Structures are given as structure tokens and as C-alpha cells.
Motif scaffolding. Sequence first.
Motif, PDB file in Angstrom:
ATOM      1  N   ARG G   9       0.790  -1.230   0.000  1.00 23.28           N
ATOM      2  CA  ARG G   9       0.000   0.000   0.000  1.00 23.28           C
ATOM      3  C   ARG G   9       0.821   1.279   0.000  1.00 23.28           C
ATOM      4  N   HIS G  10       0.213   2.380  -0.431  1.00 24.63           N
ATOM      5  CA  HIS G  10       0.891   3.676  -0.403  1.00 24.63           C
ATOM      6  C   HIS G  10       2.271   3.663  -1.044  1.00 24.63           C
ATOM      7  N   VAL G  11       2.390   3.071  -2.226  1.00 24.04           N
ATOM      8  CA  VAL G  11       3.664   3.088  -2.941  1.00 24.04           C
ATOM      9  C   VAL G  11       3.429   3.499  -4.384  1.00 24.04           C
ATOM     10  N   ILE G  12       4.358   4.259  -4.951  1.00 24.96           N
ATOM     11  CA  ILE G  12       4.214   4.691  -6.333  1.00 24.96           C
ATOM     12  C   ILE G  12       5.371   4.180  -7.163  1.00 24.96           C
ATOM     13  N   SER G  13       5.067   3.386  -8.180  1.00 25.26           N
ATOM     14  CA  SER G  13       6.109   2.796  -8.996  1.00 25.26           C
ATOM     15  C   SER G  13       6.095   3.340 -10.403  1.00 25.26           C
ATOM     16  N   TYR G  14       7.060   4.181 -10.746  1.00 31.07           N
ATOM     17  CA  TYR G  14       7.110   4.775 -12.074  1.00 31.07           C
ATOM     18  C   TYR G  14       7.943   3.934 -13.024  1.00 31.07           C
ATOM     19  N   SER G  15       7.660   4.011 -14.321  1.00 34.67           N
ATOM     20  CA  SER G  15       8.424   3.255 -15.315  1.00 34.67           C
ATOM     21  C   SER G  15       8.369   3.874 -16.694  1.00 34.67           C
ATOM     22  N   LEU G  16       9.245   3.434 -17.593  1.00 38.07           N
ATOM     23  CA  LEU G  16       9.232   3.943 -18.963  1.00 38.07           C
ATOM     24  C   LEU G  16       9.104   2.881 -20.034  1.00 38.07           C
ATOM     25  N   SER G  17       8.650   3.275 -21.215  1.00 41.38           N
ATOM     26  CA  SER G  17       8.456   2.320 -22.291  1.00 41.38           C
ATOM     27  C   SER G  17       9.795   1.921 -22.835  1.00 41.38           C
ATOM     28  N   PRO G  18       9.905   0.677 -23.282  1.00 43.66           N
ATOM     29  CA  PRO G  18      11.215   0.236 -23.735  1.00 43.66           C
ATOM     30  C   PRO G  18      11.728   1.095 -24.873  1.00 43.66           C
TER      31      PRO G  18
ATOM     32  N   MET H 221      17.668  -7.649 -27.548  1.00 40.95           N
ATOM     33  CA  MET H 221      16.249  -7.922 -27.316  1.00 40.95           C
ATOM     34  C   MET H 221      15.948  -8.117 -25.832  1.00 40.95           C
ATOM     35  N   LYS H 222      16.823  -8.850 -25.131  1.00 36.54           N
ATOM     36  CA  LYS H 222      16.674  -9.029 -23.692  1.00 36.54           C
ATOM     37  C   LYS H 222      16.784  -7.698 -22.963  1.00 36.54           C
ATOM     38  N   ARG H 223      17.724  -6.848 -23.365  1.00 37.48           N
ATOM     39  CA  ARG H 223      17.895  -5.574 -22.690  1.00 37.48           C
ATOM     40  C   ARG H 223      16.812  -4.570 -23.048  1.00 37.48           C
ATOM     41  N   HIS H 224      16.158  -4.722 -24.198  1.00 38.88           N
ATOM     42  CA  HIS H 224      14.930  -3.981 -24.492  1.00 38.88           C
ATOM     43  C   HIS H 224      13.819  -4.353 -23.514  1.00 38.88           C
ATOM     44  N   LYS H 225      13.464  -5.645 -23.510  1.00 40.16           N
ATOM     45  CA  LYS H 225      12.390  -6.170 -22.669  1.00 40.16           C
ATOM     46  C   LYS H 225      12.715  -6.130 -21.181  1.00 40.16           C
ATOM     47  N   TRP H 226      13.965  -5.874 -20.802  1.00 33.85           N
ATOM     48  CA  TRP H 226      14.323  -5.714 -19.404  1.00 33.85           C
ATOM     49  C   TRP H 226      14.675  -4.283 -19.030  1.00 33.85           C
ATOM     50  N   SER H 227      14.742  -3.404 -20.018  1.00 33.76           N
ATOM     51  CA  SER H 227      14.972  -2.005 -19.721  1.00 33.76           C
ATOM     52  C   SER H 227      13.802  -1.484 -18.924  1.00 33.76           C
ATOM     53  N   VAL H 228      12.591  -1.855 -19.314  1.00 32.45           N
ATOM     54  CA  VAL H 228      11.422  -1.309 -18.641  1.00 32.45           C
ATOM     55  C   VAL H 228      11.610  -1.382 -17.138  1.00 32.45           C
ATOM     56  N   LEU H 229      11.916  -2.565 -16.631  1.00 32.67           N
ATOM     57  CA  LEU H 229      12.118  -2.722 -15.206  1.00 32.67           C
ATOM     58  C   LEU H 229      13.380  -2.045 -14.742  1.00 32.67           C
ATOM     59  N   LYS H 230      14.433  -2.123 -15.538  1.00 34.96           N
ATOM     60  CA  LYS H 230      15.708  -1.574 -15.101  1.00 34.96           C
ATOM     61  C   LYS H 230      15.678  -0.058 -15.040  1.00 34.96           C
ATOM     62  N   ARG H 232      12.612   1.289 -13.869  1.00 35.86           N
ATOM     63  CA  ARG H 232      11.519   1.510 -12.941  1.00 35.86           C
ATOM     64  C   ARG H 232      12.004   2.252 -11.726  1.00 35.86           C
ATOM     65  N   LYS H 233      11.311   3.324 -11.377  1.00 35.15           N
ATOM     66  CA  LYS H 233      11.682   4.083 -10.204  1.00 35.15           C
ATOM     67  C   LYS H 233      10.617   3.890  -9.158  1.00 35.15           C
ATOM     68  N   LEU H 234      11.006   3.405  -7.988  1.00 33.05           N
ATOM     69  CA  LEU H 234      10.051   3.167  -6.929  1.00 33.05           C
ATOM     70  C   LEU H 234      10.095   4.311  -5.959  1.00 33.05           C
ATOM     71  N   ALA H 235       8.942   4.699  -5.440  1.00 31.64           N
ATOM     72  CA  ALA H 235       8.895   5.753  -4.445  1.00 31.64           C
ATOM     73  C   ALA H 235       7.903   5.376  -3.369  1.00 31.64           C
ATOM     74  N   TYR H 236       8.275   5.567  -2.109  1.00 29.01           N
ATOM     75  CA  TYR H 236       7.380   5.253  -1.010  1.00 29.01           C
ATOM     76  C   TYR H 236       6.734   6.520  -0.542  1.00 29.01           C
ATOM     77  N   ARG H 237       5.414   6.551  -0.558  1.00 24.72           N
ATOM     78  CA  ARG H 237       4.717   7.761  -0.186  1.00 24.72           C
ATOM     79  C   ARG H 237       3.697   7.466   0.887  1.00 24.72           C
TER      80      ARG H 237
ATOM     81  N   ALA J  53      15.003  -3.396  -1.496  1.00 21.64           N
ATOM     82  CA  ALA J  53      16.147  -4.287  -1.548  1.00 21.64           C
ATOM     83  C   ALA J  53      16.111  -5.138  -2.804  1.00 21.64           C
ATOM     84  N   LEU J  54      14.964  -5.740  -3.082  1.00 25.57           N
ATOM     85  CA  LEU J  54      14.866  -6.615  -4.236  1.00 25.57           C
ATOM     86  C   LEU J  54      15.214  -5.856  -5.498  1.00 25.57           C
ATOM     87  N   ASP J  55      14.679  -4.648  -5.637  1.00 24.11           N
ATOM     88  CA  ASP J  55      14.930  -3.862  -6.838  1.00 24.11           C
ATOM     89  C   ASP J  55      16.411  -3.594  -6.986  1.00 24.11           C
ATOM     90  N   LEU J  56      17.049  -3.195  -5.895  1.00 23.40           N
ATOM     91  CA  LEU J  56      18.472  -2.937  -5.935  1.00 23.40           C
ATOM     92  C   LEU J  56      19.169  -4.195  -6.394  1.00 23.40           C
TER      93      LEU J  56
END
Lengths: 162, 43, 369, 184, 41, 41, 76, 240, 54, 98, 64
Positions: G9-18, H221-230, H232-237, J53-56
Amino acid sequence: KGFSYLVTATTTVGVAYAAKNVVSQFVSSMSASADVLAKIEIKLSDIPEGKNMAFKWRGKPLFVRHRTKKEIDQEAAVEVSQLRDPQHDLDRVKKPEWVILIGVCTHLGCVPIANAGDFGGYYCPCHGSHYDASGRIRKGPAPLNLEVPAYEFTSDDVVVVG
Amino acid sequence: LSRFLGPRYRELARNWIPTAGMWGTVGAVGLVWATDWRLILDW
Amino acid sequence: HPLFKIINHSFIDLPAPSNISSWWNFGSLLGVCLMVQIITGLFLAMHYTSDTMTAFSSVTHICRDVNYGWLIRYMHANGASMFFICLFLHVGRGLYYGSYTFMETWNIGVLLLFAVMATAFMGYVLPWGQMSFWGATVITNLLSIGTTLVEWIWGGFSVDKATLTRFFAFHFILPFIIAALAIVHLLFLHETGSNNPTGLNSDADKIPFHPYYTIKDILGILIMFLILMTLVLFFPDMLGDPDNYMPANPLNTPPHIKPEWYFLFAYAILRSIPNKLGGVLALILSILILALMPFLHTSKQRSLMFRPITQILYWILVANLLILTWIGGQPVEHPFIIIGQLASISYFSIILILMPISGIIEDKMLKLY
Amino acid sequence: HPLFKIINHSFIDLPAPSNISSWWNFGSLLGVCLMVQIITGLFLAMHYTSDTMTAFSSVTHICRDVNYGWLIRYMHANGASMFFICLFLHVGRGLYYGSYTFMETWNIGVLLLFAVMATAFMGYVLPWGQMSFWGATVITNLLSAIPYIGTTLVEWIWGGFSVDKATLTRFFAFHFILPFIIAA
Amino acid sequence: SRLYSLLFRRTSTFALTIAVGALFFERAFDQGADAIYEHIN
Amino acid sequence: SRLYSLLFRRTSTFALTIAVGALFFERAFDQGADAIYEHIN
Amino acid sequence: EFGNLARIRHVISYSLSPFEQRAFPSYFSKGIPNVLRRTRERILRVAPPFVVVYLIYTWGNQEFEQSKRKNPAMYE
Amino acid sequence: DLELHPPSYPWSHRGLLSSLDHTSIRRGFQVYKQVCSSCHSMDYVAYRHLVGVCYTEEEAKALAEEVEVQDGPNDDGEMFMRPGKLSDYFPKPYPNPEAARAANNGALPPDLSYIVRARHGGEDYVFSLLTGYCEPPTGVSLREGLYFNPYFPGQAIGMAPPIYTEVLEYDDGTPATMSQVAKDVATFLRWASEPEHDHRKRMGLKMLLMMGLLLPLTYAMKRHKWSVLKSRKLAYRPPK
Amino acid sequence: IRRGFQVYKQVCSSCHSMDYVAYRHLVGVCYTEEEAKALAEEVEVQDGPNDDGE
Amino acid sequence: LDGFRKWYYNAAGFNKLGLMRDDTLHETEDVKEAIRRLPEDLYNDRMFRIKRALDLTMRHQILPKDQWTKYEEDKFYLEPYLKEVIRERKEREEWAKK
Amino acid sequence: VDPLTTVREHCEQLEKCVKARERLELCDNRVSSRSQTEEDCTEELFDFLHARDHCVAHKLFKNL
Ligand SMILES: CCCCCCCCCCCCCCCCCC(=O)OC[C@H](COP(=O)(O)OCCN)OC(=O)CCCCCCCCCCCCCCCCC
Ligand code: HEC
Ligand code: HEM
Ligand code: HEM
Ligand code: HEM
């Protein structure tokens, strides 16, 4: 209850008897067939002192060896009691000049290599068992002395081993 | 291991013991008969 | 579709940890290797004859007269070697990251390991060379109810045609049992999901498998195929023994008898114990000690990512496993023997004694114990 | 328990109709026959040699020198016959009682029937008798009907100009491997 | 009725009676059967 | 950009370009590769 | 199964298109530093067992040779 | 074991993509035919094997028809000998190994078909053995029918030294020095033990080119399909 | 069966073969082992090649 | 001693991933129960810490050293909850034993 | 007329070679002096052979 269950118990034995029988024949199939389950020739002149010879008797190396004055002298000197397997050299040979052994390492069944080792008899390159000229296991992990087949000294230059 | 083998559990140990022996016995008879162990069958 | 839906649930869309490294590729590689072995084995079976008069002749006929038959044969041999490389790295991943707490998956694994070792042993007996026969005799007698059992397997007084043919049948039939056991292995795992290198609960961060760990498995398959084809097409005999290219002579014994390299660690242990029986048992324990492994975990952390002392003990274990692999090769003479004896003592003492004590010490350092 | 759940789900707590007759036994019999065949086939494979010089000799050696080898061989042959008896009665049950409306089950069935017929054909070729040799020739050439690759296919399967050792050995491999595909 | 209460009611004993009986049944069956076969031929 | 809109955007065409390319690639690869091997040995 | 996996809960996960992001952003730019960073956190745990394996292997070889080398004093 | 590990030689096929010199295989086949075929056998190498390799169909044909081959008892129970065919294998020196034991003072000359593959460091060993019949040193004495070849296990090979300089004349005319002959027969025996050496290396070259093309593309191709996650920016709010 | 084996041995064996029936088969009720052993040693089947080579 | 403990703390490296000791504890029923007893704030925070941690790890990267949790910074938040669960389990176990 | 022998000849010139050869000489006389010794010189010669042969090959096929 005893009438109904007795029938269950009766049936079980019957099935059990058939099941052991079926499984028994199968198990038995892998056992030796009739062909395998169902003679020997050596010539004393063939071997001179200090030499071993085998004729693959019964699918296994039939070591037949002649020994020297010294060879025969040391083997007797060997301490039978101190031997891993108490069997004095002569105990396994009808003739001191003539020793006959089967080449299956008591350990895992390889061929001992004649004229090699630290006991002037045999050595098995598989795990380092050293057999004396008498074929007695002297060093290593081999459990018992090489076997001496019940041979026949047919002639001064002929032998029928088993 | 008293958690599953406490003083109370010992009670259960003895309580079940007889049944356990019976089962070993059944297996024993079977082994003898099935493998035709003849050392035991001969008697 | 129900099945496709089932597949989707298991393969296309199966929640998986986002942070698993390349080591988690290896098990999938093993499955691919299994299929590769089966396929190559099938194309060896259309020309191989399991007769002691004609087995070596059939193998040479495969290598010389069948179109690309040398390719399929050396792909089969080096794929067995690649199978054992991937198997050892899979087991090492399971030991390092604490994956043995999935106990049913671990036990089905060690059953698979025993089956794969038996399959490879009988397969190496199958070409009926000098080295195959001498090795065969040795192992069967290892079984020596011992005498009877040995004779049973041999099917006669000594390994001979009777053995070769039943070894062909058993070597044919066991990889399908391995495939079924691998299906059970996959089931006992999906119930729990895969582990991650941090050893933590990865439920907060899981991703699909189709686009993320599929292309990763495809890349790992491509790299494993690169190593397999550079093993086949460039150095086809760096892992085999030259004496297997001679016909099986029961009269002639080789000066030095070895199994193939992946059995060496065991070989060393066997040779180390003076008593024959002791050797056999220790040998078995060598493999079985792993099964025993989930009951030796005394730490509150699953993985070794945050456990440096047990990391040091793990790499010492990998080190003397390599030492035991080397010793097996060395002949029987000083000082190879002593190393073998120590290396075996150190192997069993690190797995049995040193790692749980180290885990207790590590729990004491974090103010947990 | 995830292994016992499937076994329970398919054999213990499976809701079955109460009024199904003895004909519904037959499919289970087929499964038993399959195992029986596999088991007997495995014990034929420890002594059979797929060489045209030695195939008939190996079969006679099984019948005459292996302990109860005649029993396992004739159990294998008459179990193939029992397999086809149970298969025909299973298909007749499916035709009579309208069970073909389970269309996916019916199509997997007719695939299994094709696989079983191919397995039995190559198995009958395997002892390399007088009957086996010619029969194989005929059916391989049966393919020849194909306008373009008929000959090529026949050549391919035969593995040569005419059925000979090349065939026997690949027929041994295929006859070995297809009952596991039948089990799957 | 005694038998049920003694060797057929407790499953462990049920197995015991089965195994023991089977152990002897073979002796009897083989013997009896052989007699018949011999008499026939 | 034209190629994408022409042979790489419609999956059917994507397959077409792949298959056709592969059909010719073999010719080119084999030829080029052989040249190299021959030059080497 | 995706869904009903755990409570987050209460988490924001941003991402970009390949296709919107560079394929190998600063691949050798930071890759090298990182790989090197990694090697220095694990080299002291990994390497010294294999170092002493190399010493034991060489030692064994040389010792074995010396063992084989004839004893000059012997046979004289 | 107790023998000089044969010193490696700069072979023309030693390299990673280096094929065999086929003129040397032809010369080594001539060396085997004129010298080595009297005692050693080549059971898995038919005359056809030569065809296409240092010899053509017709070339081998004449070579095959120079010898005679018993073609069975025909239909009259008449074992009979015929000129060899491109399908005939190389002729046996002896009908059975016990005749080889009787003719070679108790020693058995092994099949030379896979000798190079069967002998550790074969190509070298072969060359060394054939060129290593040095005099036994003091302290060692060998019985008749034995020769001190340091390389041979035990240094006591029954085979007498078979290559004397100018033992045979190369049809190509290349000087028939002992060495030139040992190198040619080592190349040939090598070919024998692996007739596909050349074909394979070609495959390996195509495999290296295809993997050099395909590994960075699959990695991309792997780095394309894995860039999305790589990325990804997580933020705790936490609502806080 | 014993009488028919005698019939085969004295009449039918001149032209017809029995490739899958060794003298082993003879051993049995109709022909005891040594009966068989004498029957087998009546003939002088070539054992095969010799150490000499023939 | 504690100096080495801090060194060992650094050695553990969860600080590099900002993982509280409790975060590291491999999940166990007792742990799970204690986790359940945890207040939402801790739970939610624990979740993010773990996820981070997992992401890192996924990127094979570590937090900036300064972001790293200090030996002193680390808190045994779940420790007490766990203590209770364990004691209760022990009690019930003893009851069963007797 | 052997390039190999010529190679060996050049090899002979090599100092390392003479050193090993010297040892061999010592033992030959050593063996002779010891009327009844099973002290062979394969030990010594092998050593000599190795160097000699190893160098020989280094410059043996190239000369071939
Ligand atoms: C006291 C440590 C001092 C370290 C000084 C270095 C600088 C530290 C501060 C700056 C940071 C540098 C980079 C840090 C990387 C990660 C941290 C690290 O390396 O820590 C040291 C590491 C772990 O320390 P720890 O586990 O607490 O020590 C117990 C020792 N058993 O410990 C080690 O790496 C030591 C590993 C020693 C292993 C010796 C093994 C010898 C035996 C091998 C036997 C192999 C088999 C032999 C044959 C058997 C059969 C015959
Ligand atoms: C042509 C120049 C050759 C080559 C390349 C080789 N030989 Fe012979 N050989 C002969 C005999 C009787 C033996 C066995 C001797 C013994 O075992 O004691 C051999 C053996 C070999 C080997 C095998 C060496 C090994 O380690 O097993 C090899 C590689 C070899 N030879 C090469 C007999 C003869 C001949 C009859 C006098 C002649 C001619 C050749 N050989 C020729 C050659
Ligand atoms: C069911 C599938 C399989 C079949 C039909 C099969 C069949 C065969 C056959 C016919 C051979 C002899 C040909 C040869 O010498 O290479 C062989 C050899 C071998 N097989 Fe298999 N095999 C199978 C699976 C496997 C697997 C899974 C392994 C690995 C554990 C394996 C390991 C080996 C090995 C090591 C050899 C010896 C190769 C050599 O001669 O060096 N096989 N197999
Ligand atoms: C026959 C060879 C084997 C095959 C085909 C196989 C297959 C697989 C597959 C496909 C996976 C899932 C993907 C992965 O995590 O790598 C896996 C995981 C696993 N396997 Fe195996 N396996 C084999 C051998 C073993 C053995 C011998 C063991 C026991 C030591 C084992 C224990 C495990 C464990 C514990 C996991 C879970 C991984 C984790 O979550 O960390 N496997 N295996
Ligand atoms: C994978 C399991 C199987 C194996 C290993 C196997 C193996 C063999 C072998 C070695 C033979 C030749 C021995 C003989 O002449 O009887 C044979 C014969 C035969 N098999 Fe199979 N078999 C298998 C399954 C089956 C199945 C499922 C069928 C039925 C479709 C079948 C039908 C036959 C038939 C009809 C013969 C000819 C029997 C005869 O000589 O009259 N086999 N099999």
C-alpha cells in the motif's frame, strides 16, 4: 463382520500368492539365462619362473605363474598370521615353483597387473591393492587374497586348472 | 523434543507400541515369504 | 482453453521474483539439456546395436558412415558433460541461497541427481570400449546380499553381453523417468514459488515470466549452446578418455582406471576410506549428505547474501570439492592419498559441523540468538 | 498435499455416474494393458538385439534360454491382442452411447488409436520373421501412394532401397519410444 | 466370532493374518496344484 | 521509418520479411562463410 | 498467482516504455565501475580458497615428482 | 607415466580453424600401404573412405583393385578372392589376432585406425615413437623382440623401427626422409581417426560467425524487454 | 520325444538343420545329462580358430 | 567487540540495501505471526524496505552509502512482537509436553 | 639425410643438453662401477631426452 472380512483376508492371500509369483518370475528373468549358466587348458612349459600367464578361463583372467628360488623363499618368509588373509604361499600352490590365481581384485573386480607393485607379486591400478607373489593381499583396500582355482598339474609341462 | 515427546507423550508411546510391533511383524513375515528368505523359512 | 490456461498459469504468467540472477537460468538449461540428450540419444538408437561383437563397430559406423553421425554422437557425449556442469551449478545455487528449505523440491532434486548419475554411468558403459568395460566391472562389484546383487545386475559371472544389453535398456528408459520426476520437481516448487538471492519474501516485487525470464532463458540457452558447440566442434576429446577408443579387452587391464570427471569427487572419497564398505557408504553419503542438508539449517536468514562467515565456509567447500575432483585423477601414491583423506574429512566436517555452528555464531553477532 | 490432491482429484473423490455398466471398465483395462505391455516390453528389451543377423536368434534365445522368457514374450504378443480387443470395445462404447460429444476427448482418443496402430505394426516387424519382413515392405510402400514423395518417404522410412537392417533398427527405436508418448 | 475380535478387527492383525496365511498358502497351493497336474498328465 | 510502416508493423508482413530474408540469408551466409574458411585453410 | 499475492500500500512505482529509453544507458559508463565495485565486495570471500587450491595442486605435483625422482643415496 | 610426454609439434591442423594438408594425407596413405599394412590393420576404413580425400573414385578404384578380397563362398560354398571394390575395407594382415601374436613374437600390433585418437597425445606420440627408437641407456636391458623407445610405455615396443630414411619413395617425389615420412603417416593416421576433421572445422567457423551475429542481437532484445524494469523508479509515499 | 529325437538323429539330420536347439535342450526327462553328454560327444563339431590361428 | 559487530553489520551489507535486521530474518510462522501483530506503519514501511532491496538486487546495485542504515540506525522493531509469539508458542508446547 | 638429426645436431649444441648428457655419463660409469646395481639411467636419460626432444621439436617441424 468376520464372514465379510475373512473373505477380504482370504482374497488377499490369494492375490498375495499370485503377486509374489508374477513378480518372482519377472525378477527371475534378469537372472542368468540357460546359455551362460551352462573346461580348462594350460601348459606348464608355457611359463618360466618369475612370470604370470592367463587364459581368460570362465571369462576371467586365469593367472598362472612360475616362481623363482627367491620368489618362493620370500613368500614362505611372509608372516601368514600377519597376512591380511592368512594363507601361506604353499597353502595356495601345489608346487612352490608353480602358483595359479584368478585375476579379480577382491576389491571391485579389476585385473591385477603382474610384475608391478611393492610386493613383487601384483598390483591393481583400480584402488592400489598390492598382492604378493602368493596373490595374498598385502597392502591397500582389497579384502581377501586372490582365489586359487582347484587346478590340476596334468604334466610337468601341462596343467588343467579346474 | 519434549514438544512431541513429553511425559504425556511417553504414555502415547507405550500406548501405540503394541501396534507398531505388529506392523513390523507383518513386514517380517512378508520379507521372509516374499524374498523366500530361507534362513527363516526353513525353521 | 483449459490446458493453455494451465500452461499460462505455469509458464506464460507465473509470478516470479524480479531480482533472480543468471544462476536461476541453470535449471531451465538442465531441462533443455535433458531434451537435447533424449533427442540425440534417439538418433543414436537408430544405428546402435547392443551386442558385444557389434557395439564398437556400430559406434564407429555412426561416426564414419551415418551422415553427421559424428556430430550427434559427440553432441550426446558433450551434452552429458554439459548436463553435469549445469547440475553442479544448480546444486551449488541451491546450497548457497538457502533453497533447500523447499524440502520436497530438494528431495525430488536429489532423487533426480541419483537417477542422472546412474543414467550417465550406464551410458558410458554403452560404447563397449576398453575404459567402459573396466569401469563397469568395478562399479558392479562395488555393490558386492552383495554378491547376489552384483551377479544379478551383471546378469552373469562377469559383465559381458548380458550386461551390455540390459544397460542399453535401462539407459534408454531412465531419462523418461527423469522427465516425469522433473515434472514433479516443477510442481513441488510452484506451490511455493522460486527463491531470490536476497533470501527475503519477494511477494512485494514479482513480475511475469513470459517477457522477463523467458528471453533471459533464451539468452542462457544460446550461451549454453555456444559452449556446447565449441566443445563439440573444436575440442571433441578434451573431456573424454583416449583409452575408450580401444575395443574392450577382458585380458588387458588399463594402467589407471577412472570414471568420467563428474564422478571423480566421489571416486576420491571412495579411494580415501580404507575399508571397502566404508568407501561405498561414504560415497553414497557424499551425494546423500545433500538430502540431509535441510535439517542442518540453523540460521534465521535463508540466503547467504548477508552471511559472510558461512560464505567463506561455502567457498572452502567448493574449493575442496575441486580438490577432490583433482585427486581422483591423480594415481595412488604419496601425497595424493593424504590430501584425499583430508579433503574428504574437511568436506564432511564443513557440511555436517562447521556451517550450523557458523550460522549460530552469525545469529549471535546480529543480537538474535 | 499437491501430489496427493491430483490423485484424489482423479481417482478417489471423483464424482462418477452410479449406473455405468461394465463397458466403462474397458478404458481402465487399456491403461493396465499399456503398463503390462511396457513392462513386458522392457523385459524383452534386455535380451533383444535389433540386428538382422541376430534378431530371430535373439527371439529364440528369449524363448529357449532366458528363465520364463517365453512367458514374457507370449504375454507381450497376446497383450497386444488384448489391447486391441479392449480398444475396439472402448471405441464401440464411445460410438453407441454418444460419448463422442466430448469432442476433445474423442480427438485425443483417435490420435491415441493411430499411435497404438503404428506401435503394433512396428512391433510386429521387430521379430524379423518371414511374415514381418514382407509386411513391413508392403506398408512402407503403402506410402509410395504419395504422388511426389511417396517413393522418397518410403525410402526415408526404410532408410534404404528396401527394408533391411536400416529399417529394423529404427523400427526398434520407434517401437520403444511411442508407448511413452501414448502414456502422455 | 472370536476370530474377528482376535485377528481380523485390528488392521495390524488383519495384515498379520494375511501375510502369515499367504506364507503358508503357497506351500499348500503349490502342493495341491502339483498333485492335480501330475494326476492329469 | 518507411520500412517499419511497410514490412515490420503488420505481423503478417513481419513474418514475410523474416521468411524471405532467411531464405536469402542462407545463400549469403554460406557463401561468405565458405570464403572465410577457404581463406583460412 | 498474480493478484492476491501480498498486501502492498501507499507506494508509487514509475516506469518507462522500452522504445522510449536508450537500450544501453551508460553501459560502460557505470557498468565498469559497478562490476569493479562488485568484485571488491566479494573477492576476499571468494579468492583465497582457490589460491590455496592452486598452491596445494602445485605442491602435490612437485612433491609427487620429487617422490618419483630416484634416491641418489639409494643404489650406491 | 614413466615416459617422455611427446613434445608438441607445430602441425598444420593444430590451429583452431586449421584443416589438414591433404597432400600429406595422400603421402601418409602411401606410407601405410607400402610399410605399415604388413602388420597393422585398418578395419573401419574402407577404400571408399579414400575417395574424395587425396584420392578420387577412380584413383581409389585402381588402388582398391590392386588387392584381392575373398568375396565369400559364393553359391558353391566356394570361398573365392576378388579384386577389391570401392566398397571393400582395407585388407587384414592376419585372419585373426592369434596369427598376429604368432607372427610378431607374442605381440599384437593394434588397429591403427584410431591409434591417434586412442593414444594420449597421439599425433605427437606417433611421430615420437616412430622417430624415437633411441639406444637403451646403461642399466636397462631389453630382451629380443623389444626396442627402447622412450615414448612407448615401458620403452619396450615389440615393433621394430619401421621407417629407415628412404624406406619408400613418395610418388610426389618429396624427399622420403624418415621424418618427412613420420609426419605424413601421422597426418594420415590422424585423418583416419577423424575423416571429418575438415568438414567439422568449417561448421565451427559458420557457428562462430552465426553466434557473433546472434549473441549481441539476442542480448539487445533481452535488454529492451528488461529495460522497462531496469528503469523503474520506486517511491514510497506513506500518506503521513 | 526321445524316440523322435532318435529318428531325427538317424534320418532327418542328413538334410535338415536345428540351429536353435543345442544339446543343452537334450538334457531332461527324455534324455538325461550324461546321456546327452555322450550324444553330444558322438559328434566332433569344429570348435573354431586356434591360438596358432586356425 | 561492538566495533567488530558494527564491522560485521557492514559485512552483512543489508545496510547497503537499507535492510533492518528484522527485515533480513527469513520468514517463519513465528516471524509471520509477529509480522501480523506489527502495526500498519511498521508493516507498510517494512514492505517498502523489502521491495527496495529486491529492486536494488535486480539491478545489482546498492544504495548510496549515506542512505545505508547505520549499525546504530538499525532498529529491532519486530523483535518484541516476535518475543511474545515465541513465548506463547513455548507455553503451548510445554502444555502439550505435559 | 635427416632434417631431424640435423635438428638434433643443432640441439646437441644447446648447453642445457650437454648438462643433462653429463649426468648420464656419470651414471653410466656409476652403473658400471656398481657391478650389481639395478640403478638404471632411464631416470637420467629421460630427463635428457625430454629437453633434447622438446627443443628438437621446437625446431623440428619448422625444419621439416
Ligand atoms: C580479519 C579480516 C581483515 C580484513 C582486512 C581487509 C580490509 C577490510 C576493510 C576495508 C574493506 C575492504 C573490502 C571488504 C569486502 C567485504 C568484507 C570482507 O572481506 O571481510 C573480511 C572477510 C569476512 O570476515 P569474517 O568472516 O568475519 O572473518 C572470519 C574468518 N574466518 O574475511 C575474509 O575475507 C578472510 C578470509 C580468509 C579465508 C582463509 C581460508 C584458509 C583455508 C582455506 C582452505 C581451503 C581448502 C584447503 C585444502 C583442504 C584439504 C586438504
Ligand atoms: C608406419 C611407418 C608405421 C607406423 C606409423 C606405426 N607402425 Fe607399427 N607395430 C608393429 C608391431 C608388431 C606393434 C606392437 C608392438 C608391441 O605392442 O610391443 C606395433 C605398434 C605400433 C603402434 C602402437 C604403439 C602403442 O603404444 O601401442 C604404433 C602407433 C605404430 N606401431 C606405428 C609392427 C609394424 C610393422 C611390421 C614390422 C611395421 C612395418 C609397422 N609397424 C609400421 C608402422
Ligand atoms: C532416453 C534418451 C537417451 C538415449 C536413447 C540414449 C542413448 C544412448 C546411446 C545409444 C549411446 C551410445 C552411443 C554413444 O556411444 O554415444 C549413449 C551414450 C551415452 N549417453 Fe545416452 N541416451 C539417452 C540419454 C542420456 C542422458 C540423459 C545422458 C546423461 C546423463 C546420457 C549420457 C550418455 C553418455 C555419457 C554416453 C557415452 C558417450 C560416449 O561414448 O562417450 N544419455 N546414449
Ligand atoms: C534433473 C535435473 C534438474 C532439473 C531439470 C531441474 C529443473 C528445475 C527447474 C526448471 C527449476 C525452476 C527454475 C529455477 O529456479 O532454476 C528448478 C528449481 C529448483 N531446483 Fe531443480 N532441477 C534439477 C535438479 C535439481 C537438483 C539435483 C536439486 C537439488 C539439489 C534441485 C533443487 C531445486 C531447487 C531447490 C529449486 C528452487 C530454486 C529456488 O527457488 O531457489 N534441482 N529446478
Ligand atoms: C515401450 C514399451 C515396449 C517395448 C520396450 C516393446 C518392445 C518390444 C520388443 C523388444 C519386441 C520384440 C520381441 C518379440 O518378438 O515379442 C516387441 C514385440 C512386439 N510388440 Fe512391443 N514393446 C513395447 C510396447 C508395445 C505395445 C504398447 C504394443 C501394442 C501396441 C506392442 C506390440 C508388440 C507386438 C505386436 C510385438 C510382436 C510380438 C510377436 O513377435 O508376435 N509393444 N516389443
